[model samples]
Target: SAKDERAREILRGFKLNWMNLRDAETGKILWQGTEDLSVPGVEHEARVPKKILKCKAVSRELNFSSTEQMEKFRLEQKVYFKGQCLEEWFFEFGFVIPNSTNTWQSLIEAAQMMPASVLTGNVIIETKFFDDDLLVSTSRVRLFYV
Candidate 1:
């Protein structure tokens, strides 16, 4: 199932780009970086990831059963979504907000404004954070099937 899902995502984003290595001499742009290959007799067809650039943020109250589950979903989706951002940067004009503050609140504020989604396998994963990861007056969350 994981392989299938990964393959679907890969296949859904495919493109061929034509670039000239020099003004007079023409060479192909490959893999957003190089053009050389090891295969003996391979053609010069570059396939690149067609990423969805500047995806609109779909922020809403997430519904998860527990903090542990919500935290797990947050960590997982954060990595996955960041990878998507990388592809967008490589394919499209890369644009990322400067989080010079480096604080968790500032970082979370930036991410909260970005396009990301929550998934609990077949169900949607909802998430929210309150105050901070503090012992006193911690955040409360709710989860429901819809």
Candidate 2:
């Protein structure tokens, strides 16, 4: 039920403009997604025969109880779009407060900020929680096209 609800929510969306992804390393578009392939990129034909290889990989680290452990793992290793850490996104402490009393609002009106430590091999992302209900999660997303 939860999966279905999430899928439905994601699928039902306003049809926004689409962008086509042309092969950055190939003169010809290897594939097209939404047919908006007008904007050309700086892609040239392959000098060699083996120039059209695409790569995709998913690496998941599950259920980190705290943010500290998650930070440690990222610092110690180099995670790539499957080489070393290229870029990262950190989502912290999303909360829904419980209040049956009169008008209560937990409006975090400040801009969300994270201190990122970029190294030669990997990048570090972290968040500071003003409250105890700081949700902790980790995700590694990698995608490469040639």
Candidate 3:
């Protein structure tokens, strides 16, 4: 299985960082430290762990109202695999539009998908969307990583 291993080696891709929000304009730190409610981070950015732990509690918030007529930014959890479209076919608001959640949502019991927070991904698959001044929260957001 050397061939398989090689492909595996090529893609030890997961979180470059924990789920977070960033102001793409000024590159300001908006939100982070959500991988764990108490602690948050990734194992490796350039390699893979033999068995890395997965899933953690998290939420997002982007209360951008007033001032600029247009603003754009985003957030991401792990990878960028969009099996479901954000607010396109469903969820309507961006993520339900405001609080981006979907079947593609990889959440934890301590998890929550809340307002204007516009991005994140987990493992092999992911949910995706963009934000201007938008998305709602996913109050009952749940996941099944089987």
Better of 2 and 3 by lDDT: 3
Assess candidate 1 and give its TM-score to the true structure.
Answer: 0.16
Question: Whose lDDT is greatest here?
Answer: 3
**Candidate 1, which segments miss by more than 4 Å at Cα?**
23-146
Expressed as tens digits, the lDDT of each residue in 1-146 for candidate 2 is 66445323322321113322233333343432332111123221212112222312212212222212111112112234324344443333233222211111111112122222222123222222212322222223222222
- By lDDT, rank the candidates, best first: 3, 2, 1
Flag regions of model 2 displaced more than 4 Å.
Answer: 14-17, 26-146
TM-score of model 3 (CA atoms): 0.22
Least accurate 10 contiguous residues by lDDT in model 3: 135-144
lDDT of 3 by residue, 106-137 (tens): 22222133221232223222223233323211
TM per prediction: 0.16, 0.19, 0.22
In model 3, where do residues sit more than 4 Å from their true spots? 10-21, 34-83, 87-146
lDDT tens string, model 1, 104-127? 110111133232233112222121
Clash list (residue pairs), candidate 2: 79-84, 79-85, 93-135
- Tell me how many residue pairs clash in candidate 3: 12
